[PDB]
Design a protein around this ligand. Sequence first.
Ligand SMILES: Cc1cc2nc3c(=O)[nH]c(=O)nc-3n(C[C@H](O)[C@H](O)[C@H](O)COP(=O)(O)OP(=O)(O)OC[C@H]3O[C@@H](n4cnc5c(N)ncnc54)[C@H](O)[C@@H]3O)c2cc1C
Ligand SMILES: Cc1cc2nc3c(=O)[nH]c(=O)nc-3n(C[C@H](O)[C@H](O)[C@H](O)COP(=O)(O)OP(=O)(O)OC[C@H]3O[C@@H](n4cnc5c(N)ncnc54)[C@H](O)[C@@H]3O)c2cc1C
Ligand SMILES: NC(=O)C1=CN([C@@H]2O[C@H](COP(=O)(O)OP(=O)(O)OC[C@H]3O[C@@H](n4cnc5c(N)ncnc54)[C@H](OP(=O)(O)O)[C@@H]3O)[C@@H](O)[C@H]2O)C=CC1
Ligand SMILES: NC(=O)C1=CN([C@@H]2O[C@H](COP(=O)(O)OP(=O)(O)OC[C@H]3O[C@@H](n4cnc5c(N)ncnc54)[C@H](OP(=O)(O)O)[C@@H]3O)[C@@H](O)[C@H]2O)C=CC1
Lengths: 461, 461
Amino acid sequence: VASYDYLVIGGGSGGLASARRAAELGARAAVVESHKLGGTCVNVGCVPKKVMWNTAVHSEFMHDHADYGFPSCEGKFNWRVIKEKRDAYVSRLNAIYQNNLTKSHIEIIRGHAAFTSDPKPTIEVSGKKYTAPHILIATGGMPSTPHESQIPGASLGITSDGFFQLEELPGRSVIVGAGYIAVEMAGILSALGSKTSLMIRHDKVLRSFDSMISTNCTEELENAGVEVLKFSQVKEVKKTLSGLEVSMVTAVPGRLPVMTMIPDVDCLLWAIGRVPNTKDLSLNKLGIQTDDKGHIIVDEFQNTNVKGIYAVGDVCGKALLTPVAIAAGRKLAHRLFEYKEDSKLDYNNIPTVVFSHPPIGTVGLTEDEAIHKYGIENVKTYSTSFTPMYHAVTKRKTKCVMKMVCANKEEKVVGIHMQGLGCDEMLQGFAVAVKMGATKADFDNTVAIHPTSSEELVTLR
Amino acid sequence: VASYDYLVIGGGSGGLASARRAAELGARAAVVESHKLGGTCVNVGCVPKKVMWNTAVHSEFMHDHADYGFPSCEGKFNWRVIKEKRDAYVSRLNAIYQNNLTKSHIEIIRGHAAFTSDPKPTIEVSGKKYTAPHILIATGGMPSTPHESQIPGASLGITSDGFFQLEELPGRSVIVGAGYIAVEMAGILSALGSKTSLMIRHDKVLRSFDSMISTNCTEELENAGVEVLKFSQVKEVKKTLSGLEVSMVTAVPGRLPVMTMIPDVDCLLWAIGRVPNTKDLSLNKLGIQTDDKGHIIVDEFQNTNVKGIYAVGDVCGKALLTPVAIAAGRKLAHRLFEYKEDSKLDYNNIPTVVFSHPPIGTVGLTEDEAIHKYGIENVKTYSTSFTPMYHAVTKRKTKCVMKMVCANKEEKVVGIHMQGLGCDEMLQGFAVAVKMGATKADFDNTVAIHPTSSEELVTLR
Ligand SMILES: Cc1cc2nc3c(=O)[nH]c(=O)nc-3n(C[C@H](O)[C@H](O)[C@H](O)COP(=O)(O)OP(=O)(O)OC[C@H]3O[C@@H](n4cnc5c(N)ncnc54)[C@H](O)[C@@H]3O)c2cc1C
Ligand SMILES: Cc1cc2nc3c(=O)[nH]c(=O)nc-3n(C[C@H](O)[C@H](O)[C@H](O)COP(=O)(O)OP(=O)(O)OC[C@H]3O[C@@H](n4cnc5c(N)ncnc54)[C@H](O)[C@@H]3O)c2cc1C
Ligand SMILES: NC(=O)C1=CN([C@@H]2O[C@H](COP(=O)(O)OP(=O)(O)OC[C@H]3O[C@@H](n4cnc5c(N)ncnc54)[C@H](OP(=O)(O)O)[C@@H]3O)[C@@H](O)[C@H]2O)C=CC1
Ligand SMILES: NC(=O)C1=CN([C@@H]2O[C@H](COP(=O)(O)OP(=O)(O)OC[C@H]3O[C@@H](n4cnc5c(N)ncnc54)[C@H](OP(=O)(O)O)[C@@H]3O)[C@@H](O)[C@H]2O)C=CC1
């Protein structure tokens, strides 16, 4: 039984970030990883997605070429070219991350970890045992898929994992779900030329975002050529002569349900959520608490119910974002190895960007959330809607919507929501201001930057 | 003699903004304008410039087309197409601004105003007299040009005003100066295909910006195909058979001076500063104080030396930016018509973006300024340099540089400087945080947005 100061299960964002900070603090740490370092972010998430987004962004801009005085650009996108360059870039990152571990003197134990029956918390990887007074579980999650028992043929569809394996642009694609991945992938497939349908259970995407965003985002998708199938769900899938055939039921409220077949589908993409990866950990041998989805339960300090065992990142099922896993893993290293007992991540006011077209940025409370928290009489919003000056000369148009949610008499800024060109890079600094407790006067007292889209946020009336 | 509550001389950014806020407060105001409403910003500045920048941005992106899996875009930019659409857009804005005035019940007196000999401050426009207990001078400035006495043939060159009149892309262009307009125009002309030279008196552009910026910006220009002629200045210009011929003297320190002729020049652009427009105002009839460049002298409240006469914007020669003229004009309306005696614009921490390629954003003190203000022992900077993920797949590359200047033990953020893709829309929110007095801990305690360029500012170490 090899002993360490810190044992980290999972070499993804949260696991790596925690291990590296702990090692800086003098801990002798090892990282157990059964696949590729970098985990979801590097291999099948953030990184490869953003590359594909930049590619779709090129497609849109190229529609505006002639309006801008250039000669029309003629045609066919070649999926394989960018796919190969994307994969290579991912290979570069894996090599970098591995080097980051070695330079920090962190040991990398390759293989699949599982807890043992042993009294003191101990894991087994490939026959060998390892132990530590502090063990971090940061095993992430996986894409959720329907059971064949509920949706026969569900297994003919792919997930975001399978999207990253595609070698050619699918001719006809159908995306199921109404959250981040659905919106992102539909926007990428569509811009690149796939005839795309987005199938959602209600009438709008991103129903947990401020209602201004869910409305605007749904419209922007339609305006971009994405067919949004409202109030619809898959009843069954089957492999026909040439592609898949999707049976769906559409149940608009106030109407009779109607069954439709979608034929000749090349790609069926399930974008219905993620499940925690705790199934094969043998948690129950230590009696570690999980919810009924398999998530590990933790307190505000990332403690599990068992002493000396912690969990961070997607496996805990809260705020499933790379930078959250990293921040939580780092605060945890400071608490453990620098004895900062108050060291923990504040889960309020975490900013997030949805890489749609145009992109969405949001931080803090939606209008309804602030209304519930402070009361209607105490909530004031400001908003604007305009067409970016970029489109002053184009036939194609997109809009920019911004909303500021303020609370109390002081008009404390409790939420910012926006969609528009440039919104991916605009959010970070406002998120700093919101975190510091800015009021509307603080915004208003900042001189604007002209001509930009960002200046609108500081001149709301 | 028609009397008003407020008389505004000049219908540009500062003048319009002040008049409109005063009218909201109940003032009976009139705006005197001798040319087009919207002044410099709308007609020959901010707006038409940004349209041309977006156009150059299209040119660059189109170089990356093939790398992104698309087929190569072939060619020739057509200046006249975008020029016509730009002019139309400017026509739209003029009509909008005029409507904004009318809806506010502001009178527009068309013509050129000049002060009279009259005791109580009174102006004359086209034979008629007008007076008010509060008169605002917001007449802006003009491009500065060399005298034929110092540089013979200087008058064969154009200014930024003349740039906006060009109907075709000049084949060969030479830009003189090393400030905002020089950098902007060189970057636009070059991206659009003109064979461009930038002639600067020293070795770097933007020598008043943080030294990291001036260095990086000079290199980015060279990497983009702009020929930077260091330690050089124009000795004379002459009209040859086919274009202009520029005589220059190059005096590298530690070297003998050398004279060079630049032949076949299509466009010679003077970008050497601006002069205030006070010459024809008859200021001296009231004894209003000006500096030796003709700028009007004002106090912290925009007061001139004469009671009931104020000045804002470019004519005062300080912080020559649209949003500064607007903010100063507005604070001034609140002081005058809402009796807010403490109402004034803080000239510290005004953010500014230079529309270069890539764009520059800066707010607060440069490293040297903070060193002078707090002392070397009390100044700490953090910086980063990286290649944006956008270029992970391109043969063409640009860099992103960021520097944070902190002061004292608390590490108060006193300056932010950056250049890179997205930096035009990224600055605004950090400028809010800087204005509020954020410290580095405030930045560091804000969860990042991944994957973006902006996240780098909150993870500096
Ligand atoms: C398509 C997609 C796009 C996304 N885009 C973004 C975005 O733009 N921005 C953003 O902020 N977030 C984004 N996310 C979410 C973000 O990727 C995740 O929140 C983040 O990767 C979660 O990190 P983690 O450390 O919890 O887990 P992961 O990164 O999943 O790491 C878990 C690791 O543990 C390993 N492992 C699991 N079990 C074991 C075991 N028993 N033994 C050994 N090793 C094991 C796994 O192989 C894996 O490498 C995206 C996600 C997806 C799926
Ligand atoms: C090429 C260029 C690009 C720029 N780009 C930017 C940028 O991107 N962002 C930015 O923030 N700033 C930019 N600036 C600077 C910005 O345009 C100026 O700071 C701003 O316009 C100054 O406003 P003002 O109200 O002082 O004057 P102006 O807008 O010049 O208004 C003065 C007005 O007074 C009128 N006038 C003058 N004398 C009289 C008289 N006697 N009687 C009647 N009317 C009179 C003039 O016709 C004019 O309309 C740019 C400037 C230029 C030249
Ligand atoms: N840009 C970024 O930061 C990105 C972050 N991520 C992270 O990864 C997480 C996982 O993303 P994703 O998988 O999109 O999950 P989400 O939970 O974001 O989205 C799924 C949505 O699909 C709908 N849905 C649920 N079950 C079904 C079903 N059986 N059939 C049809 N629709 C269904 C629901 O919306 P409704 O109730 O309206 O039907 C549900 O909320 C994200 O939430 C985010 O935390 C992922 C991608 C990008
Ligand atoms: N994006 C934005 O916000 C923009 C804002 N503006 C505003 O308008 C102002 C006017 O812009 P611009 O006209 O560029 O003025 P600036 O004062 O910005 O730049 C001029 C520079 O050229 C050099 N120079 C001065 N005299 C000469 C000469 N005789 N020969 C050669 N070079 C000379 C000097 O630099 P050195 O000492 O190194 O030689 C000088 O500082 C700006 O400063 C800014 O306030 C303008 C454009 C864009």
